[PDB]
Nucleic acid binder design. Structure first.
Ligand SMILES: [Mg+2]
Lengths: 90, 165, 54, 251, 268
RNA sequence: GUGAACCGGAUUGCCGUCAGGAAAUUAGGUGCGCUUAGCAGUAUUCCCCACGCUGUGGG
């Protein structure tokens, strides 16, 4: 509701949520560790965190230093992804 | 533990093409290749939605790689430090036993990101010594807590007890 | 290189083992952890009557 | 009133104190063997050193031949299982194989200061008693035994101090009944300080305390608990806080 | 002055790949909003030049712009065209600085100072909102039997013709009934493409009072938006100067905030 | 204020010279994704303000 259902990087509507940090889990969740992004941005920042080992603090889409990496990853995702593999889940 | 059992069942529900695609991605991370990431996501993420104690992304990816490479049958009571130990007796005590023992005890100095090739050669010597059964669930549950002393403490203990028989 | 009046060893920067991640190499992370410990000790046990340089 | 100092420090591979056979000194605790540095080592380690020499001082604090010394030092104890090793060394001729041995451990120490006996031994002096207390604080925070330090240059610096003003003398050595197992997501020092945290969080549920950590590296307690009164970032500031809690006192 | 712009969208190629620009066009609220952030606040463009902050409606200037979307341009490639008319200078480099994959060509802008004389032959293209507000009784349920309730609804429905007249004749009558007040007269008007437009829109709704207070917890609820669309092309002649300019950059029909009035004029 | 009070097991040390895991192996034999579908000639278009008993203006 707060983000007006708009992505934080590319401004397309928002469907998922990424966690900026994991200080509190499960029982307590202040809505300042959460940002609204769409599917391509979620997958891009998910693949940016496969082997990082940063544990607590995750990627902030507001910070400009990650934007050029994220857009190149999104260009890779648009270049390479097969939709028909995502559907028909094998 | 639940969530593991469905993960191993979904691994066994796979077909030829999926096993080949995880086979070609051996020795790599996931973020480089997109079909592997998508297949792993479609096979793993609903379980993480439903169950909180679903396997981590790295351990699940590694176990998927090993199952795609070796394709052992799932059966309770065929865990790794038992078949190691049942195998070690048939070798010469002077030469080959320390050689196999060193490769087996090298695992206590490696991380989950670094534990693909020693596991590859250990299941290789299984496949060479004509074995078809292996407890994957126990291996996943001990790898998920591999960084604890009692887990590798009961590792080689199961080994010693199988070897002494 | 450094200059003291009292010997201070900085071996405890590596009590946590260094795990290689996809970005950096072993050398850069080793000297980064060493820099973190050096910064923390410099901002910690520090007396104005005998300041140090290096 | 008793001023009690809690002390956690890590140490590099060396051998500070040895017995007649040469072995690293070792006590028994918690069902296993513990690395040990003698209290009669920290005495004559801090004592007669150059940094500490800064009514006569160093007699009221530590005695010599009914002196009634007002400082008590306990035996340092490791927070994990002792893991000794033996090194093999050979000699040259430049024109036989021996063995030396060493041990590495993280030790918890404990310091207690009697204020009333210190004031009584100062013939009514009070600024001198607090002066000697501060002097012992700066000495003890920056003193190591002079063992095999030429070959094993062990010159490590501490990683946390908590100071207490409790009514009766009580140590926290029972917090280390269970030996510390190292997990991937932590280290030895963090888990040791956490084990110290989940023994001061108790007792009160089942006094005050000033805490310091260098540039606030490993914060006491793994929540926002008030288990320590104040968390400070300098050794001089912690000493000034101790003097301030004693009374109006400037360093 | 009047500012016109053009945006080009591929809308084609391999269907198996993600196409965010192709996906953006399925909702008219999203299209209108995406054109709507093209005008920041003098303060906003100094605050976040990277456009990497939460989007709020109040930090952007208000201007009643008009737009239309067209398709079917060949040349061995498919294209989708958005034409935006506005009274302020658009900032296309700020709206799409993180959305370059939407468009197959960089945006363009140009000035427009249309000066005309009375009695001039002009070619126009317009998509009209065919809507009439009517009195409707209330039908409910329809669970195999119709239940009538006495409430009469004042609602906006589509224009309806009879069974004996063509849609083009009735649309032309509906446009010539209005052309004397705008300042133009028809000679020919034919129907090209008639249809419906769907849209969906976030609307906040209260759920639960906060335990700490100061507001609610809220949840997004989505409301349908249906309109009738009929695309028309023809030739008109001018009747008044400051009156034809009163017709332009103001709108002819309704629903102008969702791209339902735009006159594209060519002197034939 | 205790068989207690005072109380460093300390100094010396290169494991350094010597080594091919090597010879030889087809993963080949068989399979239709098949029967279906106007983005339009309509009879309610989700909400709001204003004026009359349908025409403007905003989402
Ligand atoms: Mg996005």
């Amino acid at each position: 509701v707060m983000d007006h259902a708009a992505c934080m990087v590319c401004k397309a509507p928002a469907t998922t949520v990424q966690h900026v940090n994991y200080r509190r889990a499960g029982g307590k969740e202040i809505p300042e560790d959460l940002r609204a992004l769409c599917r391509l941005c979620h997958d891009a920042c998910t693949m940016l965190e496969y082997g990082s080992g940063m544990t607590t603090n995750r990627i902030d889409p507001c910070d400009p230093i990650w934007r050029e990496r994220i857009l190149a990853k999104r260009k890779e995702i648009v270049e390479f992804r097969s939709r028909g593999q995502r559907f028909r889940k094998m | 533990n639940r969530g593991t059992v469905d993960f191993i069942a979904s691994l066994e529900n796979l077909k030829e093409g999926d096993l080949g695609i995880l086979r070609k991605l051996r020795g790599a991370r996931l973020d480089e290749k997109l079909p592997g990431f998508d297949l792993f996501s479609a096979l793993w993420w609903p379980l993480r939605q439903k169950n909180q104690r679903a396997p981590k992304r790295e351990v699940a990816w590694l176990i998927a790689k090993l199952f795609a490479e070796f394709r052992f049958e799932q059966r309770e009571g065929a865990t790794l430090p038992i078949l190691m130990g049942g195998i070690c007796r048939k070798l010469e005590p002077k030469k080959e036993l320390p050689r196999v023992l060193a490769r087996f005890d090298q695992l206590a100095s490696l991380d989950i990101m670094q534990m693909e090739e020693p596991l590859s050669v250990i299941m290789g010597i299984l496949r060479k010594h004509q074995q078809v059964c292996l407890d994957w669930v126990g291996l996943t549950d001990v790898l998920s807590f591999w960084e604890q002393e009692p887990v590798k403490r009961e590792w080689s203990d199961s080994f010693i007890k199988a070897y002494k028989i | 290189v450094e200059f003291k009046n009292s010997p201070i060893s900085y071996a405890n920067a590596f009590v946590r083992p260094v795990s290689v991640v996809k970005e950096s190499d072993l050398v850069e992370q080793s000297i980064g952890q060493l820099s973190n410990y050096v910064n923390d000790i410099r901002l910690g046990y520090y007396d104005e009557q005998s300041p140090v340089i290096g | 009133m008793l001023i009690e100092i809690h002390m956690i420090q890590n140490h590099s591979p060396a051998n500070l104190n040895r017995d007649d056979l040469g072995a690293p000194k070792t006590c028994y605790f918690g069902g296993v063997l513990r690395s040990r540095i003698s209290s009669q080592c920290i005495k004559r380690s801090i004592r007669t050193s150059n940094d500490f020499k800064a009514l006569a001082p160093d007699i009221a604090l530590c005695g010599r031949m009914t002196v009634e010394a007002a400082l008590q030092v306990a035996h340092a104890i490791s927070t994990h299982i002792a893991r000794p090793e033996i090194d093999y060394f050979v000699a040259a001729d430049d024109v036989h194989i021996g063995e030396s041995m060493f041990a590495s451990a993280c030790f918890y120490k404990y310091f207690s200061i009697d204020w009333e006996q210190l004031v009584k031994n100062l013939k009514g002096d009070t600024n001198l008693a607090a002066h000697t207390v501060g002097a012992f604080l700066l000495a003890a925070a920056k003193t190591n035994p002079s063992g095999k330090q030429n070959s094993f240059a062990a010159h490590n610096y501490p990683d946390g101090i908590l100071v207490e003003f409790k009514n009766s003398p009580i140590s926290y050595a029972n917090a280390f009944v269970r030996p510390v197992s190292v997990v991937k997501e932590s280290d030895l020092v963090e888990q040791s300080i956490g084990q110290l945290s989940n023994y001061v969080n108790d007792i009160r549920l089942g006094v005050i305390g000033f805490w310091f950590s260098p540039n606030n590296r490993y914060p006491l307690g793994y929540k926002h608990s008030k288990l320590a009164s104040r968390n400070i970032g300098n050794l001089n500031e912690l000493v000034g806080a101790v003097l301030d809690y004693i009374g109006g006192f400037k360093w | 002055m009047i500012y016109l712009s053009r945006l080009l969208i591929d809308t084609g190629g391999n269907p198996d790949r993600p196409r965010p620009g192709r996906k953006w066009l399925d909702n008219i609220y999203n299209v209108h909003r995406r054109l709507s952030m093209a005008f920041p606040s003098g303060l906003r463009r100094e605050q976040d030049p990277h456009f990497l902050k939460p989007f709020s409606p109040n930090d952007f200037q208000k201007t009643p712009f008009l737009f239309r979307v067209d398709n079917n341009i060949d040349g061995n490639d498919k294209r989708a065209i958005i034409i935006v008319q506005s009274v302020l200078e658009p900032d296309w480099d700020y709206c799409f600085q993180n959305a370059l994959d939407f468009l197959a060509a960089p945006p363009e802008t140009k000035e427009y100072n249309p000066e005309f004389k009375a009695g001039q032959l002009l070619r126009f293209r317009l998509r009209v909102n065919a809507s009439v507000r009517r009195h409707i009784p209330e039908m409910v349920q329809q669970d195999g039997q119709t239940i009538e309730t006495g409430k009469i609804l004042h609602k906006r429905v589509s224009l309806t013709w009879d069974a004996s007249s063509t849609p083009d004749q009735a649309l032309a009558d509906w446009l010539a009934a209005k052309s004397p007040k705008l300042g133009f007269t028809l000679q020919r008007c034919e129907l090209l493409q008639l249809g419906w437009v769907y849209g969906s829109k976030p609307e906040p709704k209260n759920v639960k009072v906060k335990e700490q207070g100061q507001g609610y917890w809220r949840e997004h609820k989505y409301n349908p938006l249906r309109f009738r669309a009929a695309l028309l092309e023809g030739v008109l002649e001018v009747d008044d100067p400051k009156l034809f300019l009163k017709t332009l950059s103001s709108g002819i029909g309704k629903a102008k905030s969702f791209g339902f009035g735009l006159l594209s004029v060519l002197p034939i």
